[PDB]
Specification:
Strand order of the largest sheet of chain B: 4-1-2-3-6-5
Helix content of chain B: under 10%
Strand content of chain B: over 45%
Organism (chain A): Western equine encephalitis virus (WEEV)
Largest sheet of chain A: none
Strand content of chain A: under 5%
Order of helices and strands of chain B: EEEEEEHEEEEEEE
Number of strands of chain A: 0
Shape of chain B: globular
Number of helices of chain B: 1
Number of strands of chain B: 13
Distance between the termini of chain B: 21 Å
Subunit structure (chain A): The precursor of protein E3/E2 and E1 form a heterodimer shortly after synthesis.
Subcellular location (chain A): Host cell membrane; Host cytoplasm; Host nucleus; Virion membrane
Protein name (chain A): Structural polyprotein
Oligomer: part of a larger assembly
Radius of gyration of chain B: 14 Å
Number of helices of chain A: 3
Shape of chain A: rod-shaped
Structural class of chain B: mainly beta
Radius of gyration of chain A: 21 Å
Transmembrane segments (chain A): 18-44
Chain lengths: 48, 153, 153
């Protein structure tokens, strides 16, 4: 072989697709709970 | 009167009290022990630790005996377990150093036979004892009021 | 009252009642039997399975003797077949041990005698039973309500 497998490219775009897809969604709500906390707290501070 | 409300018990201390309002048991969360009305202990609680309170639906067999809360909070006297409290400047205020620790979960009642709020514990600047308490917004928003540095009772 | 409403007979055993309001005839769906009015018994009824209620129309001669209902619905005391009945906080109540099975379809009337609710059933408990009943929105749109653990009568 005249080349060595750069792991950054060993995953095909068609396969790397799933990695870059599933690693995003898992985090999708990590901040949303705190966002809801902020919203409810500022609503209280607006009405308290 | 308040006999439709009951003490939580631990170590032999009436370490707090609890109220049946709107068909839900309410008790302070920071206070642990046996609620003296043993039927209330069959209820499984849900918690609101930011409010330091927890609640659960009281059994139907006596749920119609529950007290009911108010939207009304005009300034003035309200009947309390230690006689009355003066609601003023939009705050529950008590004479400097009266009542106190042991009253967690004690209700404060509308003269019409309704409950205006539930106390958590007090503070005092000197002029008056300031009360930390959970109350109600005119549209039913439950809101905890707590003067700064308020101690648990 | 019983002057403008009729019982339902099952095998000649009374098991409920039917009420005419605005000339519309209403009957509790779970009360198997026939309305005790042969001039009405020929009516054809439409039903509301979510309301457990079905309805029809009275003959043109008796349109004048129908009840009428309104949504003004002030809080507090009301009258019932067994006398005093009460409503507040979105619940209708009557002392424990009155009503129950075989007594659904009963109307609730204001001082003016205007009807505001008709009984579907309820839960028997504590000081006051928790009635399950049909009512109306402030705008007069019907609403049927069933407190937790209520049962049809």
């Amino acid at each position: 072989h005249k080349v060595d497998q750069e792991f950054q490219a060993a995953v095909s775009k068609t396969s790397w697709n799933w990695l870059l897809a599933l690693f995003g969604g898992a985090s999708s709500l990590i901040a949303v709970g705190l966002i809801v906390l902020v919203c409810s707290s500022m609503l209280i501070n607006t009405r308290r | 009167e308040s006999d439709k409300t009951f003490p939580i018990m631990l170590n032999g201390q009436v370490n707090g009290y609890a109220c049946v309002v709107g068909g839900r048991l309410m008790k302070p969360l920071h206070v642990e022990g046996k609620i003296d009305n043993e039927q209330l202990a069959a209820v499984k609680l849900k918690k609101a630790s930011m409010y330091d309170l927890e609640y659960g639906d009281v059994p139907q067999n006596m749920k119609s005996d529950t007290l009911q809360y108010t939207s009304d909070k005009p300034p003035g006297f309200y009947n309390w377990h230690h006689g009355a409290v003066q609601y003023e400047n939009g705050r529950f205020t008590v004479p400097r150093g009266v009542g106190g620790k042991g009253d967690s979960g004690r209700p404060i009642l509308d003269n019409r036979g309704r409950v205006v709020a539930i106390v958590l514990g007090g503070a005092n600047e000197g002029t008056r004892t300031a009360l930390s308490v959970v109350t109600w917004n005119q549209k039913g928003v439950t809101i905890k009021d707590t003067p700064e540095g308020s101690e648990p009772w």
